[PDB]
Predict the structure of 60S ribosomal protein L6.
Amino acid sequence: AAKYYPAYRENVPKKARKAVRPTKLRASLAPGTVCILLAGRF
RNA sequence: UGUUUAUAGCCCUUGUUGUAAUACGUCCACUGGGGACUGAGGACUGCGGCUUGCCAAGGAUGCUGACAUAAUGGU
């Protein structure tokens, strides 16, 4: 099959059960809101 | 000074509004937030929920950025 296999039987990680679910933003950050930038260049 | 709701009212008992409210106690296998520390394990098995796939259910993954530097780290 492949060429130059590693001399170590690879350790596959255990199947994680972390499912990505949609972020629930703050109830006060509706579109059209005026906001204040705290960090960054602005 | 003396009296008995009058041109203020109060105290006691009962009825009512009443299945009154609140406080306190207790409980919810009811629920909304904010912060902190930790991520041990390493294919598959298990117990469960959902609808075979999915799942927060036998231990962290995902999306990114900066720097790739003495920056982290050590002496």
The radius of gyration of chain A is 23 Å. Residues 11-21 of chain A lie near RNA strand B (CB under 10 Å from a C1').
